[PDB]
């Protein structure tokens, strides 16, 4: 008699929970896409940094040769100014 | 290539030469106006030396056409920016970029 | 009975759906926390890149002045070998 | 209060980097508890830097300079020789003592 009523109540409680499950799943799926894109961003910035450091190294290699050539040319100028 | 359109006029006579440091503020956007970077958000003007290939080709060509004080829109096609690869999470493959650039000074 | 089967079926469906909701809720919370942390590492790498570019620029300025000094030293050496 | 160098595998004991030389290395960077924050090995890509050009943290400059070609070593670096009070949010926390597993592959 009264058991027909409670079965309908629990059906409506199940629909409500089913709706909540979907809201949390979708929220989670959206956050998962943001994270993957943000993780991709980290990898790309790392590789940008790797390039910038390779550039610093290339500059310092060139700076090394210029410092040597300047030192020798200064030495030769001092030798000439004596004689 | 790169297209240069004037937002706000500069002095119209002080253009940067190779070996000069350009000091700018910029906002970087995709073609729909979505921002991906900005020196203004950091309150930190960006600096680079013209002609040393420190920046993308579109900037090398675009900024050299600007005079001190000028604010300009640079529309940069992917061959003058990041091409077929882009930068995952930041710049899609084959993206046209829009930069709002202001040339603040030269040093 | 008739309803005891459907009551047992509704109990099982509700608890299974609730458990799934709880897992999605937890996942969404953990992904949000992980996203915030990855976003901080993105900012830090941006600042590392800013520093490395300032280092490139500094090397390029120093190369320019080193080259200029080398040129002045060469002109001076050449003038000593004439005068 | 500096950097400590503990040999994992010995080098040739003869070829030491000079300032101005490019060091080619592999490294794994870890926090004091052993949590990995970076690795050139995971990238399959040796890391390069020139010694004596202020390109790396002081703990590296001092530690790698003590290594010979072929040597693998553990560098334990105090915060003052690394990233200090500030660290790098999301990667290196405040006042982090760092441990680098470093191998000197060659000089160029
Ligand atoms: C991918 C960075 C790229 C590397 C490169 C250098 C030389 C030639 C070709 C490429 C080069 C780098 C230069 C020097 C380093 C600057 C470091 C800090 C200030 C930047 O915020 C970096 C971390 C990000 C990386 C991702 C980029 C999409 C972009 O967001 O810069 C960006 O706005 C951009 O597209 N920028 C930054 C502002 C100037 C225009 C353009 C550029 O040329 O970038
Ligand atoms: C914060 C990076 C720091 C900046 C700096 C430069 C000169 C003097 C003082 C500091 C300097 C930079 C060097 C040259 C750039 C190299 C670029 C690529 C290979 C690195 O993966 C960068 C993107 C990350 C940044 C965050 C760091 C926590 C660490 O994960 O490197 C790292 O492992 C480290 O602690 N590294 C990297 C390998 C050598 C040891 C040490 C270091 O000295 O780094
Ligand atoms: Mg030197």
Author numbering:
A (entry chain D), C (entry chain C): 2146 to 2228
B (entry chain B): 2 to 108
D (entry chain A): 1 to 108
Original authors' sentences:
FKBP12–WDB002–CEP25011.4 crystallizes as a heterotetramer with C2 symmetry, in which CEP25011.4 forms a homodimeric coiled coil and binds one FKBP12–WDB002 complex on each side of the coiled coil. Consistent with the rapamycin and FK506 ternary structures, FKBP12–WDB002 binds CEP250 via a composite interface, with FKBP12 binding to the constant region of WDB002 and presenting the variable region to CEP250. The variable region of WDB002 buries an extremely flat, hydrophobic patch of the CEP25011.4 dimer interface composed of Leu2190, Val2193, Phe2196, and Leu2197 from one protomer and Gln2191, Ala2194, Met2195, and Gln2198 from the other. The C16 hydroxyl group, the only hydrophilic functional group presented to CEP250, forms two hydrogen bonds with the side-chain carbonyl and amine groups of Gln2191 from one CEP25011.4 protomer. At the opposite end of the structure, the aromatic starter unit of WDB002 makes a π–π interaction with Phe2196 from the other protomer. Side chains of Gln2191, Gln2198, and Gln2209 from one CEP25011.4 protomer form hydrogen bonds with the side chain of Asp37, and the main chain carbonyl groups of Lys47 and Gly19 of FKBP12. Arg2204 and Ser2189 from the other CEP25011.4 protomer form hydrogen bonds with the main-chain carbonyl groups of Lys52 and Pro88 of FKBP12, respectively. Two mutations, Gln2191Ala and Val2193Leu, attenuated the binding affinity by twofold and fivefold, respectively, whereas binding was completely abolished with the introduction of the single mutations Ala2194Thr and Leu2197Phe, underscoring the importance of these hotspot residues in WDB002 recognition and binding. In the CEP250 structure the 80s loop extends away from the target interface, as compared with calcineurin and mTOR, most likely to accommodate binding to a flat surface. In the FKBP12–WDB002–CEP250 complex, FKBP12 primarily facilitates complex formation, with WDB002 providing a hydrophobic hotspot but only ∼30% of the BSA (510 of 1,700 Å2).
However, neither rapamycin nor FK506 alone can stably bind their target; instead, both are “presented” to their target as a tightly bound complex with a ubiquitous, abundant cellular protein, the peptidyl prolyl isomerase FK506-binding protein (FKBP12). We show that a subset of compounds encoded by X1, in complex with FKBP12, bind to a topologically flat surface within the coiled-coil domain of the human centrosomal protein CEP250 (also known as C-Nap1). CEP250 is a core component of the centrosome and is predominantly composed of sequence predicted to form a coiled coil. CEP250 is a component of the centrosome, the primary microtubule-organizing center of mammalian cells.
